[PDB]
């Protein structure tokens, strides 16, 4: 599924991400835009044999199990397939662990390169939230 | 049956080949949740979903029965149907000129909406609710009953999901249907309103503004004792 802007903002707010670890909802929507273009089925293969999955491009070496990544730790204790659902619960629960891993949202490369420092509340202006 | 071979047959452009494989998948998916899981595990759902676009109505009917049966499983099975992208085509099929196709799409939606709040939410986001409210004015009593069951399921969610049903303008039709000469229509309307009445004070207040109270009071003395208790219990949730 390709979410709409406010559709994803409302989903992320219902799941507890607005100002989680002090990151306003606009940061999370922006991160999704630049990581996945709002596509829940997005996948990216890395040269290290890991893959990034779903709306927030969660990595198969550290966070989820795809059964094909060497050195995998599965710190979110979740199959990588759950992170491709239209039900964003598992990607949100994993995101809350990631954001707590010592780097805040700097864990998301596209956030650091496209969203950080910007007027991220533009991603939620107009939404019923 | 070989499920992988059934699923590969759905790569066919041949309409006779597509109809025989769809029929077999549908029958297997009727056999309970382990059978549903085998159909899912074989990769059936992407092709079942693409086929909801078949201009061929018999292929469409079979694909809907398969999807409907899969969506009778547990919440993760429903979620796989959602994830495969069924909902937009299902909602478009509520506008089918074929009443049989309409009924089947409505049944599939009803089953998806019988899941948890995330499954209900998918149904709302896909834009089912205004169509379902329209269908409460169907001359076809089967269509009306299935539309009421789907609404009642949606209204079994959280307060925001209830409020989506209220915001789609369900309440006038529902209060009206408490006067149906059909006792099954009445019971389903009553169930829907009873679910709406389990929401917060705003939801309860909307049910009262729509004139539910006068009619629920009347129904405490309906001839049917199950309707009496349903009405007595809806009233208790509102009075609360």
Dihedral sign for Cα B165, B169, B171, B175, please: negative
* Same domain, residue pair B135 and B117: no
Q: For residue B9, how many other CB atoms are within 10 A of its CB? A: 18
**Nearest Cα residue to B147 out of B107, B175, B184, B180:** B107
Token couple for A110: 């596209």
A7 at the B interface (CB within 8 A)? yes
The secondary element (H helix, E strand) that includes residue A58 is strand A58-59
PDB experimental method: X-ray
**Is the CB of residue B188 less than 8 Å from the CB of residue B149?**
yes
Which of A41, A42, A44 has the alpha carbon at shortest distance from A52? A44
- Give every CB contact of residue B6 below 8 A, 6+ residues apart in sequence: B21, B24, B25, B42, B44
Residue A59: enclosing H or E segment and its boundaries? strand A58-59
* Numbered residues of the known binding site of A: 101
CB under 8 Å to B76, separation ≥6 — which residues?
none
User: Which of B43, B80, B83, B121 to mutate: most A Cβ within 10 Å?
Assistant: B83
One domain for residues B184 and B147: yes
Using DSSP bridges, classify how beta strands A58-59 and A43-45 pair: parallel, antiparallel or unpaired.
unpaired
Do B150 and B66 share a structural domain? Answer: no
Are the C-beta atoms of B63 and B54 separated by less than 8 Å? yes
Given A7, A11, A85, which is nearest B83 (Cβ)? A85
Report the sign of the C-alpha dihedral through residues B122, B100, B53, B130, in that order.
negative
Rounded Cα distance, A113 and A123, in Å: 16
Instruction: Please give the structure tokens belonging to residue B196.
Output: 């709406």
What are the boundaries of each domain within chain A? 1-129
> Do residue B37 and residue B122 come from a single domain?
yes
> Which residues share a beta bridge with A58?
A53
Closest approach of chain B CAs to the CA of A85, in angstroms?
6
CA nearest neighbour of B59 among B92, B89, B27, B21: B21
Burial grade of B148 (CB within 10 A; 0-12, 13-18, 19 or more): buried
For the beta carbon of residue B139, count every other beta carbon within 10 angstroms: 7
User: Any chain B CB within 8 A of the CB of A48?
Assistant: no
Chosen domain end from B82, B111, B127: B127
The CA distance from B200 to B4, in Å, is 48
The question of whether A48 is a catalytic residue gets the answer no
Assess contact for A35 and A115: CB atoms under 8 A. no
First to last CA, chain B: 55
Name the CATH topology of A1-129: Lysozyme (1.10.530)
Statement to judge: residues B110 and B213 lie in one domain: no
Residues B8 and B109 grouped into a single domain:
yes
Residues B31 and B137 in one domain: no
Q: What φ, ψ does residue A113 adopt, rounded to 5°?
A: -90, -20
Q: At what resolution in Å was this solved?
A: 1.6
Which chain A residues touch B121 with a CB distance below 8 Å?
11
Contacts of A125 (CB under 8 A, 6+ apart): none
| Residues in contact with A17: Cβ distance below 8 Å, sequence separation at least 6, in sequence order | A23, A25, A28, A92, A95, A96
Annotated binding site of A for substrate: 101
- Residues of B in Cβ contact (< 8 Å) with A40: 83
Structure tokens at A10: 């409302």
For residue B221, give both structure tokens: 């003395």
Q: A48, A52, A66, A87: which one is catalytic? A: A52
> Phi-psi category of A33—alpha, beta or left, where left has phi over 0 and alpha has psi -120 to 50?
alpha
Tell me the residue range of the domain where B134 lies: 128-240
Domain count along chain B? 2
Which of B127, B155, B183 is where one domain is finished?
B127
């Amino acid at each position: 599924k390709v979410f709409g802007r406010c559709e994803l903002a409302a989903a992320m707010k219902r799941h507890g991400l607005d100002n989680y670890r002090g990151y306003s909802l606009g940061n999370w929507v922006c991160a999704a835009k630049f990581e996945s273009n709002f596509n829940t089925q997005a996948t990216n293969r890395n040269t290290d044999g890991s893959t990034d999955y779903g709306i927030l491009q969660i990595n198969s070496r550290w966070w989820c199990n795809d059964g094909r990544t060497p050195g995998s730790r599965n710190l979110c204790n979740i199959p990588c397939s759950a992170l491709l659902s239209s039900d964003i619960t598992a990607s949100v629960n994993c995101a809350k662990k990631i954001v707590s891993d010592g780097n805040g949202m700097n864990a998301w490369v596209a956030w650091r390169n496209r969203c950080k420092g910007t007027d991220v509340q533009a991603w939620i202006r107009g939404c019923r939230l | 049956p070989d499920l992988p071979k059934l699923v590969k047959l759905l790569k066919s452009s041949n309409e006779e080949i597509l109809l025989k494989a769809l029929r077999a998948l549908a029958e297997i998916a009727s056999g309970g949740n382990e059978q549903i899981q085998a159909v899912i595990d074989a990769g059936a759902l992407p092709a079942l979903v693409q086929l909801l676009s078949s201009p061929n109505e018999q292929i469409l009917q079979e694909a809907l029965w398969a999807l409907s049966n899969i969506a009778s499983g547990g919440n993760e099975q429903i979620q796989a149907v959602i994830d495969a992208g069924a909902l937009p085509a299902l909602v478009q099929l509520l506008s089918s000129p074929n009443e049989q196709i309409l009924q089947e799409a409505l049944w599939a939606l009803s089953n998806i909406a019988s899941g948890g709040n995330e499954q209900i939410q998918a149904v709302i986001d896909a834009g089912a609710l205004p169509a379902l409210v329209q269908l409460l004015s169907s001359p076809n009593e089967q269509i009306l009953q299935e539309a009421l069951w789907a609404l009642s399921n949606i209204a079994s969610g959280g307060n925001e999901q209830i409020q989506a049903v209220i915001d789609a303008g369900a309440l006038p039709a529902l209060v009206q249907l408490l006067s149906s000469p059909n006792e099954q229509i009445l019971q389903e309307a009553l169930w829907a309103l009873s679910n709406i009445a389990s929401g917060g004070n705003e939801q309860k207040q909307a049910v009262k503004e729509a004139g539910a109270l006068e009619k629920l009071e009347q129904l405490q003395s309906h001839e049917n004792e199950k309707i009496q208790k349903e009405a007595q219990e809806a009233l208790e949730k509102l009075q609360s």
